[PDB]
Amino acid sequence: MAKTRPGVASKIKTGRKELDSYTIKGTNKVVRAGDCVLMRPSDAGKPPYVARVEKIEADANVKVHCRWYYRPEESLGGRRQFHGAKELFLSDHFDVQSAHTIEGKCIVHTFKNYTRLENVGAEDYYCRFEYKAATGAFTPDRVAVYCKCEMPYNPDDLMVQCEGCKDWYHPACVGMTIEEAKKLDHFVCAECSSPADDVKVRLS
């Protein structure tokens, strides 16, 4: 496997010297390049902005080069039913912000790693899509779909796998309650671990 290792993460104002880190005022929370952070939004009462810290720099104080994450509702197409509560899109939208706008730290997991968390905390997010903020285009533009409803996997929703198709199903879509599904010894579907751990067939 041959791949490159880009020397710089931010293209803006490469002229400054990098700070190794920045500590959130009054806390033990240390922010470094590569970390993801929560920032106070303009509008009050709304969830904080999530960003990846690409670079830290100061003047004569401290500035951070942010690569914005977009919440599904913040995106051009809005939130769809298959988007998880903690789902984020990694955008190509960059900004320079005062480091003082940083509220706290968070972790933006890979989808697979997110589904394997034994406990999802307030700081735990995930990302499976990159997002072109100027157009609203997604990468990848095609994802696997499941069930009768032919939808992408929403990690928030319980699904059961058929012992025939290996396809996954929402209980409600196959006419059963969540409790009934949870009680099952087996399941073979009428057409006949998580979908994140499946390797197969893709749709736009």
Binding site: R40, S42, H93, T101
Partner: peptide, 8 residues
């Protein structure tokens, strides 16, 4: 303390 995003 509030952050302001540029327009994409």
């Amino acid at each position: 303390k509030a952050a302001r995003k540029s327009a994409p």
